[PDB]
Amino acid sequence: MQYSIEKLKKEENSLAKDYYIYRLLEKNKISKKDAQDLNSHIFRYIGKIKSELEKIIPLKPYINPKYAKCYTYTANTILDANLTCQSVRLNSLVFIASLNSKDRTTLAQTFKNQRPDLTNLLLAFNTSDPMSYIVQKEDINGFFKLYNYSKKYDLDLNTSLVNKLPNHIGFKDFAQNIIIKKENPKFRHSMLEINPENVSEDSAFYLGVNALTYDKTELAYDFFKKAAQSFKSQSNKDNAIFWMWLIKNNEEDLKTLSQSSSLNIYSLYAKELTNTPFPKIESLNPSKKKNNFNMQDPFAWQKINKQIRDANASQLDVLAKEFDTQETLPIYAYILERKNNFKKHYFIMPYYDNIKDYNKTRQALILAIARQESRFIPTAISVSYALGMMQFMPFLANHIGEKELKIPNFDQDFMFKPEIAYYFGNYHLNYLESRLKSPLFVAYAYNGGIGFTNRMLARNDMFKTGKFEPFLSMELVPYQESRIYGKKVLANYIVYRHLLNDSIKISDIFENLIQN
Ligand SMILES: CC(=O)N[C@@H]1[C@@H](O)[C@H](O[C@@H]2O[C@H](CO)[C@@H](O)[C@H](O)[C@H]2NC(C)=O)[C@@H](CO)O[C@H]1O
Numbered sequence: 001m002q003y004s005i006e007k008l009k010k011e012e013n014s015l016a017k018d019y020y021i022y023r024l025l026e027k028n029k030i031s032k033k034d035a036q037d038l039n040s041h042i043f044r045y046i047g048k049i050k051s052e053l054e055k056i057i058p059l060k061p062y063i064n065p066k067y068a069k070c071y072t073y074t075a076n077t078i079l080d081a082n083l084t085c086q087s088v089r090l091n092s093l094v095f096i097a098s099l100n101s102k103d104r105t106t107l108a109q110t111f112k113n114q115r116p117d118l119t120n121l122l123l124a125f126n127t128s129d130p131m132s133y134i135v136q137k138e139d140i141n142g143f144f145k146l147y148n149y150s151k152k153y154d155l156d157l158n159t160s161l162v163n164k165l166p167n168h169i170g171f172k173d174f175a176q177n178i179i180i181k182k183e184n185p186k187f188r189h190s191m192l193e194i195n196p197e198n199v200s201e202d203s204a205f206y207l208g209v210n211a212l213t214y215d216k217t218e219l220a221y222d223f224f225k226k227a228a229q230s231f232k233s234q235s236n237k238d239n240a241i242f243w244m245w246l247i248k249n250n251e252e253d254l255k256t257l258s259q260s261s262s263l264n265i266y267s268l269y270a271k272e273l274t275n276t277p278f279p280k281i282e283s284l285n286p287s288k289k290k291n292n293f294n295m296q297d298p299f300a301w302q303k304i305n306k307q308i309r310d311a312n313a314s315q316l317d318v319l320a321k322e323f324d325t326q327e328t329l330p331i332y333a334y335i336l337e338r339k340n341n342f343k344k345h346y347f348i349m350p351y352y353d354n355i356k357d358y359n360k361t362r363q364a365l366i367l368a369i370a371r372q373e374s375r376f377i378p379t380a381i382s383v384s385y386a387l388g389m390m391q392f393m394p395f396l397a398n399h400i401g402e403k404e405l406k407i408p409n410f411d412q413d414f415m416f417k418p419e420i421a422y423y424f425g426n427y428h429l430n431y432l433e434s435r436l437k438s439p440l441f442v443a444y445a446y447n448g449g450i451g452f453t454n455r456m457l458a459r460n461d462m463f464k465t466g467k468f469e470p471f472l473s474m475e476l477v478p479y480q481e482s483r484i485y486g487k488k489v490l491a492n493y494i495v496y497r498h499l500l501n502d503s504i505k506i507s508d509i510f511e512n513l514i515q516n
């Protein structure tokens, strides 16, 4: 089924509508005339759809008509500009890098009084190490502006300066990136002296991981403990408490983790170490067969998804009742997940007929993937237009559909069919599992690709033997989306294996992550 640009302009803005516009663009079916008013028809004007629309109607990067005159000057003529213009252009470190030293000296004097931030950056670029100058001034705004201009600057930072960095918005991304990418060793070492009192949440957690990479177990514990107290989400507290336990072995930390309301690999593992029973899994078995809702209409999903996410408790009860059927099971569970404020464990097995002939281990891996990929929503579409329950990228759906399986009249929209999503999932998982073995490694490869995963596993510091392995390697997976994905799919895998009467101890999975 196709949609002309004119039928799509009549639908609500949504990722479904973006997907179908992008499909017209990649087939060259959007004329220059069709492309005129088309910005106002796009839900998320980012990535492929934007670079594709800009091949037709290039945009000039809007500069505020207020400062338009300020962008007629260059480094050769900036001294002929009024003071407002001078200060605007000096927002760019590249512009500053481009000026000659004499003009940097001049502008530094102009701005010493009302803008010492600018004076500091101008005089810093008159030296061969701008970072060393900014660090000596303990200018925090300047530090992050330089870091963002170039990652290559690296210097030791003293205790007074590191303890100021966390008060700035940039700190979280800065800490996450240098620790996970293993860049800026002098920055990394310096961050050992951050007082756990001056950090919280993700920044506290990554500083714990940092402290472990230097075998500073006392500092790591203090950071993870501050992470555990401050984190909003129970899943992240559990991750932090797991590290407090693994470092200092207080049996109270392990008890608190085994009693967690969050079902995740850390609480599952703690329950197994304390002989605590498996957590309660909800049984969803609606008597009603189907309803008037089309589970194959991607537009219908985007509309009802928006409704559900914006529903008061009362509206959730009306929706719970409409969607309490076997054909709309995945939407029922989505509504109940919200209606019970994410307190109950829902692990549905919808369109089960399509997978009952696979062995129970494979069933559990497929179900684990689909639950995290889509929550079993057949017309699920990602911001990168991954499609259906198993979230295939088009290139991959088409490679399997046309080139490998030669399905007649194949279209990538077939990924919206449960029969197809499950079938393609099985096929793709066979390819990944034959090369990778561990379901955690398959999870990384499924989300981030097998190239990425082979490159990570080849490193001699990832998933090798060590004190805190394999748990530390799972915190050092370089692509964040893939690091979170693996943990979540692993937990899902453990649960589905349990529901299918094919239980495995998560301790066996952790042992098989270490390469012997
Ligand atoms: C915190 C969390 O796990 N959030 C879930 C989302 O991640 C999930 O979206 C899916 O995430 C995958 C990576 O984990 C992507 O590969 C996948 O394309 C993406 N799917 C969609 C539809 O964007 C959503 C799915 O409903 O649920 C969140 O709870």
Ligand SMILES: CC(=O)N[C@@H]1[C@@H](O)[C@H](O[C@@H]2O[C@H](CO)[C@@H](O)[C@H](O)[C@H]2NC(C)=O)[C@@H](CO)O[C@H]1O
Pocket (backbone or CB within 6 Å): 386, 390, 391, 392, 393, 396, 445, 446, 447, 448, 449, 450, 451, 452, 453
């Ligand atoms: C289910 C799905 O569509 N997964 C996508 C990944 O497959 C994809 O990774 C790439 O997959 C190719 C097909 O097997 C590999 O040949 C390729 O090497 C791999 N890329 C890398 C960097 O390893 C990723 C990103 O392209 O997106 C997923 O959604």
